[PDB]
Paper text:
RAS is a major anticancer drug target which requires membrane localization to activate downstream signal transduction. Phosphodiesterase 6δ (PDE6D) has a beta-sandwich immunoglobulin fold which contains a hydrophobic pocket capable of binding to the farnesyl group. PDE6D binds to and sequesters the lipid of cytoplasmic RAS and has been proposed to deliver GTPase to recycling endosomes, which is followed by release mediated by the small G-protein Arf-like 2 (ARL2), allowing RAS to be trafficked back to the plasma membrane. The resultant lipid modification increases the affinity of RAS proteins toward membranes, where it is required for signal transduction. Here, we present a novel strategy for targeting RAS by stabilizing its interaction with the prenyl-binding protein PDE6D and disrupting its localization.
Within their HVR sequences, both HRAS and NRAS contain a cysteine residue in the −5 position relative to the modified C-terminal cysteine. HRAS has an additional cysteine residue in the −2 position. We were successfully able to cocrystallize PDE6D with C-terminally modified peptides of both HRAS and NRAS. The crystal structure containing HRAS peptide contains two copies of the complex, each in a different conformation. In one complex, the density is readily interpreted for six amino acids including both cysteine residues, while in the second PDE6D:HRAS complex, only the carboxymethylated farnesylated C-terminal cysteine can be confidently modeled. As the electron density for only one copy of the HRAS peptide can be modeled, it suggests that HRAS, like KRAS, has conformational heterogeneity when bound to PDE6D. The cysteine residue in the −5 position is packed against PDE6D and not solvent-exposed —whether this would occur with the full-length HRAS or this result is due to the potential increase in flexibility with a peptide is uncertain. As the −2 cysteine is solvent-exposed, it is possible that it could be targeted with an irreversible small molecule. In summary, HRAS contains two cysteine residues within the HVR, of which at least one (and possibly both) is solvent-exposed and so could be targeted to develop an irreversible inhibitor.
Residue numbers in the entry: 2 to 150
Write the structure that this text describes.
Amino acid sequence: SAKDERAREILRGFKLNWMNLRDAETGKILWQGTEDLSVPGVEHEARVPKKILKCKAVSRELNFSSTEQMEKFRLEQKVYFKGQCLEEWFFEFGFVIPNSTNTWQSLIEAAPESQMMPASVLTGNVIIETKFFDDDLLVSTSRVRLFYV
Ligand SMILES: COC(=O)[C@@H](N)CSC/C=C(\C)CC/C=C(\C)CCC=C(C)C
């Protein structure tokens, strides 16, 4: 469309290879996926162990490939509970070499146990909406429904 064919070019050349969730304090891998949760237009599912809610902070690794150059690769994540936006996250990777494969690590600090909701209430009710950007270029929007198992 009129909005850059480059955005569509980046998307066709972009692949999310795998993703990790780690205990930020110990480095134990708590959850791993190899499904491209960045694919737009379908509601992905993620089933993560309930024990993750025990962590004070988690480290999320995104390993991605991109045939296309990007000047300022970043993402915006809204966390929804039953359609209510609870959290808005911003993460920047920066410059993406064309044809590169990159591991992207981010630290997610957890809310206190006394302020965070139980797994039984959260599971199936949390939607993460991720917008993938090259600076101001919206490359894709993806939605993942969270289950705590
Ligand atoms: C430690 O307590 C917490 O902070 C709990 N509430 C969550 S830890 C963190 C994150 C997740 C669980 C889900 C992370 C996001 C996923 C799997 C999907 C995002 C999609 C993309 C493509 C980045």
